[PDB]
Amino acid sequence: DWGYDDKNGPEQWSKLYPIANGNNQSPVDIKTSETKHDTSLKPISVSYNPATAKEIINVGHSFHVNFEDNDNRSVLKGGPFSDSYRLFQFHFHWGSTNEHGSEHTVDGVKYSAELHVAHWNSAKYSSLAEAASKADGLAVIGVLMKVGEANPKLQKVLDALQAIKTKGKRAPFTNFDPSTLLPSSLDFWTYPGSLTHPPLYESVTWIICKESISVSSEQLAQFRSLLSNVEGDNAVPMQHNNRPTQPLKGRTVRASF
Ligand SMILES: NS(=O)(=O)c1cccc(NC(=O)NCCNCc2ccccc2F)c1
Numbered sequence: 001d002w003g004y005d006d007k008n009g010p011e012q013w014s015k016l017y018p019i020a021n022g023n024n025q026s027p028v029d030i031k032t033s034e035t036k037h038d039t040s041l042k043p044i045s046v047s048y049n050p051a052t053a054k055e056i057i058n059v060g061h062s063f064h065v066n067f068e069d070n071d072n073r074s075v076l077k078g079g080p081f082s083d084s085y086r087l088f089q090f091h092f093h094w095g096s097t098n099e100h101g102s103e104h105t106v107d108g109v110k111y112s113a114e115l116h117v118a119h120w121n122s123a124k125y126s127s128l129a130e131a132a133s134k135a136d137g138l139a140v141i142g143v144l145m146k147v148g149e150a151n152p153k154l155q156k157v158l159d160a161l162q163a164i165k166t167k168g169k170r171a172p173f174t175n176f177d178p179s180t181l182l183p184s185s186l187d188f189w190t191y192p193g194s195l196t197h198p199p200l201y202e203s204v205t206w207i208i209c210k211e212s213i214s215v216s217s218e219q220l221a222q223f224r225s226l227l228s229n230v231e232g233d234n235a236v237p238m239q240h241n242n243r244p245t246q247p248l249k250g251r252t253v254r255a256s257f
Pocket residue numbers: 089116118128132140194195196197199201204
């Protein structure tokens with residue numbers, strides 16, 4: 001049973017999941033003097049249908065907002081992709097304090113949290129379960145979250161947490177378009193990487209936005225007040241769930257800009 005504490009955390013994951021020391025692990029530090037601009041990269045295009053929003057779930061180490069993924073109502077196209085990728089989830093990562101909650105870093109700078117909007121390749125594969133382990137199976141947009149002014153676009157998400165306070169609780173989460181959470185510019189970096197927690201499959205093409213979005217100290221406190229225990233047990237707040245950055249191992253981060 002993996003987690004983020006000192007006994008089951010990132011630094012121990014390789015014992016149960018050897019891919020943790022792999023050649024395509026995420027997150028990474030994006031060193032902008034080493035990025036290579038690629039004129040062949042097309043703009044990112046997202047088109048999400050709010051009716052695909054389904055459920056919010058406390059998964060112990062985090063919470064997930066899941067989407068109906070039976071058709072192409074909600075898709076990501078463009079960027080480095082020739083295939084259409086189907087939205088299935090978004091979630092966040094955060095840290096113990098405002099100093100350090102993002103997963104990716106830019107030129108060594110740590111942000112306070114990070115938004116992940118995840119998709120799977122429905123042109124090539126028949127389901128998320130099939131796609132999750134394929135090199136070209138997943139596409140995840142990462143948005144760095146900079147502590148500052150309260151972000152009103154987060155309101156529905158934050159308001160839902162009181163119903164899923166403890167591990168395993170879940171609730172309907174409907175009529176929501178998560179492209180409202182993205183920054184106004186979709187200039188991006190892209191690199192081949194992995195899931196940032198077990199099973200850590202090297203199946204993710206990452207799309208990291210250049211522009212950050214805001215989040216307030218108090219909104220971050222709402223994340224950290226989620227509980228990792230089941231109802232009735234001693235309360236254990238979800239204090240952090242970000243993985244340290246991992247070596248590029250010769251990978252190239254491409255810039256759309
Ligand atoms: N931090 S991340 O690398 O952007 C990222 C992105 C998409 C999903 C997750 N986590 C998550 O799905 N947990 C449920 C675990 N069983 C479902 C499952 C298993 C393997 C792959 C995907 C998947 F959905 C994390």
